[PDB]
């Protein structure tokens, strides 16, 4: 609704699904742009979360920055799989490398979701202390 964190989390899952059915339609050189996208919508998410942090229990902020760091890591793994899919286009490891790329992005989305729950849940434990 008026929840930005929710929205960017949805923008980012959208970006992950596009990527899914558009390696099929893209050449190796283009895989850079798509991930660049997923990266950018992610920065927007991680940014609008970074904005909330101040107003809530530190006990949350630990585990929240946990899933944030987790996402950065998730991106990195996606980027690496993408690099591997470029280099390995035109070799027998082409498909597997792409398969890996999808999985990297998949769990990227999943962890984006878990970021949201951690936020929703921390938003609550905040409201009731107050």
């Amino acid at each position: 609704t008026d929840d930005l964190v929710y929205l960017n989390v949805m923008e980012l899952v959208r970006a992950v699904l596009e990527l899914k059915n558009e390696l099929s339609q893209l050449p190796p050189e283009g895989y850079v742009v798509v991930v660049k996208n997923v990266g950018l919508t992610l920065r927007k998410l991680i940014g609008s979360v970074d904005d909330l942090l101040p107003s809530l229990p530190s006990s949350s902020r630990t585990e929240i920055e946990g899933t944030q760091k987790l996402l950065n890591k998730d991106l990195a793994e996606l980027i690496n799989k993408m690099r591997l899919a470029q280099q390995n286009a035109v070799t027998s490891l082409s498909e597997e490398c792409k398969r890996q790329m999808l999985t990297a992005s998949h769990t990227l989305a999943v962890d984006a979701k878990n970021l949201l729950d951690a936020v929703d849940q921390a938003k609550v434990l905040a409201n009731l202390a107050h």
Binding site: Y6, V9, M10, V13, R14, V16, L17, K20, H106, A109, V110, K113
Partner: peptide, 10 residues
């Protein structure tokens, strides 16, 4: 609408 996209993943 998130739950929708969420399952579309699989």
């Amino acid at each position: 609408e998130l739950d929708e996209l969420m399952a579309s993943l699989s």
